[PDB]
Structures are given as C-alpha cells and as structure tokens.
Amino acid sequence: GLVVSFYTPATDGATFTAIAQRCNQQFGGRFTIAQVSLPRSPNEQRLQLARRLTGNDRTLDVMALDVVWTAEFAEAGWALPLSDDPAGLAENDAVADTLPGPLATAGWNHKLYAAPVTTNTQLLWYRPDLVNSPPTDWNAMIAEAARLHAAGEPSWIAVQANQGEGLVVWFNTLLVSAGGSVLSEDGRHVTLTDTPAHRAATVSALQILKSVATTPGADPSITRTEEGSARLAFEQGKAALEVNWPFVFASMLENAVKGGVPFLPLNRIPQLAGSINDIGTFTPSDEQFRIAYDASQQVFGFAPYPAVAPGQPAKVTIGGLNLAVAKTTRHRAEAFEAVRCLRDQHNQRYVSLEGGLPAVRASLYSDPQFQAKYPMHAIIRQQLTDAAVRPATPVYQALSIRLAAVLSPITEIDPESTADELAAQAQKAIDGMG
C-alpha cells in the first residue's frame, strides 16, 4: 500500500531500518515504513528536514527529531501536535510507560508535538587496567590524565566535542552542574551573567573547559579543526578516559569482536567466532554476551559523569530522538500509527540492546532481562531523573552556532571575558540574528 517515509540520522539508519522492517511485518501490506537517512550532525539533520518542510515535500511523513528542535518545529507548524492524530491515540501512547525527562523534551506550550523514542545521557568510560579508580569530579579527571601522561600511558580525555553541538552540550552540562543556565525559564532572557551566582557558575564551567584543554597529554586536535571521534579515539587506545553517550558500549564489544580494538582482542576468542551476523551486527547468545562482557570489564568500565563540585552528582545534559509527524504528510493516520509501532516495547528493547540507544520506556529500566544486557541501566536512569536540559527555544540553531563559535577553540578561553562574550552572543541569538 502507501509508503510512510521515516527520516533518521544516518548513524542510526541500520537500527531504525530493522525496527521499521519489523513494524512492516505487523501491518501486513496495509502500508510500509521506509527509513531514510539524514546527515550526521544535528544541524544538518535539521537543515534537510526544514528544506523539505518549507518546500512542501508531500512524501515526508515521519521524522526522528533531535530533542533540541522541538520548539522550532512546534512553533513553525512543521511538527504536528500529537492531538492532530485522527485516531486520537497518539498523546496517550506517547505518555504511557515513558520517562518524564524525554517527555519534557518532546513538548512545547503545554502540548506534545512528538513521541519520544530514544533518549541519551553521557557517562564516563575508563580503562580500569590503567586507571585504578574512575575520577568522580573534573579536577580528578585532570589529575588522572596528567598522571597517565607522566607515565607514558595513554593520556587523552576523549570528549565528543569539537566546534559544534557536542561542545555546547559539554558546556551546558558543566554550567547546569554549577547552578547556571544559558536562558531563563521562559526562554526570553540570557542568564549567563545576569546575577553574581549565574556569572560564578558560568566562570566555573569555563575554567573547567580551559583546564581540560591545557592539561599535559592533551589531544593536539583542540586547535586543529577536524571532526575526530571520542569513541574511536578510545577504541584505538589513545585515551584512557572518555565521556560519551551509552552507544559506545555496544560499539566496544562489537568492534572488539571484529578485531578493531587492540587492547581487547575478542576476535581471538573462539567461542565468539560467528557472533557477528551476516549484516555486520554483534548478536551474541546469552553465553557469548557473558564471555564478551566479562572480558571487556578488565579494560572497559563505566561510571557516572564527573561532577563539577565534590560531594554531589553532576546534572547531565539530556539528548535523544522524538518521533514527530510532518505537516507535509498525506496520511496522518498511518503516520501516527507507524510512530506508535516504532516505539513499542519490543522495538525499544531492540533499539537499546542492538542499536545502543537508551530506551524511553520506564518499564525496561525495571526489567531484569533488559538490565542484564544493558549494564549501564541504573546510572542512565539516575542521570535521566536529574537531567540538565539545553534551552528550549525556536532560535536554538543560531544560539548554538554562536555559543560554539565563542567556546571554540577551548584553549583560548579566558573565563571572565569569555563569559561576557557568551552572554553577548546569546543575546544576539535570542534578539533575532543568525
């Protein structure tokens, strides 16, 4: 029958293809979900979607939107409110058995404009064979990296943060962790330097950025403007400390079985031969997962995101993907039905245990079966409960562009003057300037 297009980031394409295919089996020919890949960066994802929307591409049906785009797509009329579902089932489905943090990312003006499908929060990953105890705050991160450098051991702090949204996320986590905020609640005012407490928080976050940037054993690519990957930098053995989203777990094991991780030769374990399936995905038995995880645990561990202040946890910036229905769709009913299928319990378990992307269904974090294959579950749920949030505003694209331009390169940050420049650029963003 008809075709419901389903646009997702390229990196997650394969995963959302599998899910889509399963859902197609459940429809029996009534309609077919067809996954289509967007570019890698959130900015480019947004740009492709917005060009199709303003161009009235009537073949665009369902969008996997980054959490930071809701506001814009809601206020422009691009993402239909879930109340526009002709069946009237979308809102109740979206809230049922769904964690409140992601739900909050999917709303605008007290209405839901998308149904959360995946969420995200950054954890600390470390080499336990080189780091005796995972650092609990950023001062300890710095000290541990310096110690590793003084010993000829891999000394990088692999943070997914170049000159784009990753750097803004890093800064936002440090800022909210110190009690600060980019914008006011209503999104109408810049709150980086408007009070002494707010300015102090901003200055603390910037000092952490500058100190990490100028720690001996730093990756020489902090000024060399490229697009390196913290995941790969850790997998190649150049970093003993990484902060990144949980999918790196699924990466480690998988690439370790493929022979791509030098310090973790899971490819040399006979019991794991053939655990990579015919399309390149690590799909172990229960026994094979036990073997792989046990071997991994000697050189690969995880821990909470490092706090900025000793004594209490960090407040970690939430990310993820919400399923929105395009205003361009010719088939609202089928599009919302597809959304409901793509986020069901089976497909949530799949998106986590095979795609590595944290699920939004609360039940799964209370599911021992799920917990056995997703060992980061407790820290993830805890950080999702106390999550930091990037400001929700229709001008988020320009705001993030300007903030990243000020923050980069982090080696040239001067906390006081940089705080003032961040405030000025954020004010330009919310004033209407991009």
Ligand X SMILES: NNNC[C@@H]1O[C@H](O[C@H]2O[C@H](CO)[C@@H](O)[C@H](O)[C@H]2O)[C@H](O)[C@@H](O)[C@@H]1O
Q: What does the binding site for ligand X look like in residue numbers (CB under 6 A)?
A: 9, 11-12, 42, 66-68, 120, 160, 165-166, 169, 245, 247, 319-320, 357
CB 124 within 8 A of CB 134: yes
Confirm whether residue 320 is marked as ligand binding.
yes
Q: Which residue from 429, 425, 432, 431 is spatially nearest to 398, judged by alpha carbons? A: 429
Residue closer to ligand X, measured from CB, 70 or 425: 70
Least separation, in Å, of the C-beta of 349 and ligand X? 17
Q: How many helices (H) and strands (E) does the chain have?
A: 17, 11
d(CA 237, CA 131): 13
Least separation, in Å, of the C-beta of 47 and ligand X? 13
Residue closer to ligand X, measured from CB, 154 or 166: 166
Residue closer to ligand X, measured from CB, 93 or 165: 165
Q: What are the tokens at 5?
A: 């297009």
Strand 319-325 versus strand 301-303 pairing type: unpaired
Which residue's C-beta sits nearest to ligand X? 319
Least separation, in Å, of the C-beta of 168 and ligand X? 7
Least separation, in Å, of the C-beta of 15 and ligand X? 9
Confirm whether residue 234 is marked as ligand binding.
no
CB-based contacts of 164, cutoff 8 Å, min separation 6:
41, 43, 404
Residue closer to ligand X, measured from CB, 242 or 334: 242
Q: What are the tokens at 121?
A: 């929060």
Q: Rounded to 5 degrees, what angle do the CA atoms 188, 55, 401 make?
A: 35
Confirm whether residue 78 is marked as ligand binding.
no
Least separation, in Å, of the C-beta of 105 and ligand X? 9
CB 346 within 8 A of CB 22: yes
Residue closer to ligand X, measured from CB, 288 or 352: 352
Q: Please give the sequence-ordered ranges of beta strands (E in DSSP) within 52-146, or none if there are none.
A: 62-66, 107-108, 111-112, 115-120, 123-126
Confirm whether residue 120 is marked as ligand binding.
yes
Least separation, in Å, of the C-beta of 88 and ligand X? 29
Q: What are the tokens at 19?
A: 């899910």
d(CA 234, CA 238): 6
Residue closer to ligand X, measured from CB, 172 or 207: 172
Q: Which residues pair with 238 in a beta bridge?
A: none
Least separation, in Å, of the C-beta of 162 and ligand X? 10
d(CA 156, CA 142): 10
Confirm whether residue 125 is marked as ligand binding.
no
Q: Is 3 helix (H, G, I), strand (E, B) or coil?
A: strand
Least separation, in Å, of the C-beta of 141 and ligand X? 18
CB-based contacts of 380, cutoff 8 Å, min separation 6:
121, 123, 246, 358, 365
Residue closer to ligand X, measured from CB, 172 or 328: 172
Q: Rounded to 5 degrees, what angle do the CA atoms 429, 417, 308 make?
A: 90
d(CA 314, CA 337): 38
The residue whose two tokens read 């991994």 is: 296
Residue closer to ligand X, measured from CB, 244 or 288: 244
Which residues sit in the known binding site?
66, 120, 245, 247, 320, 390
Which residues sit in the known binding site for alpha,alpha-trehalose?
66, 120, 245, 247, 320, 390
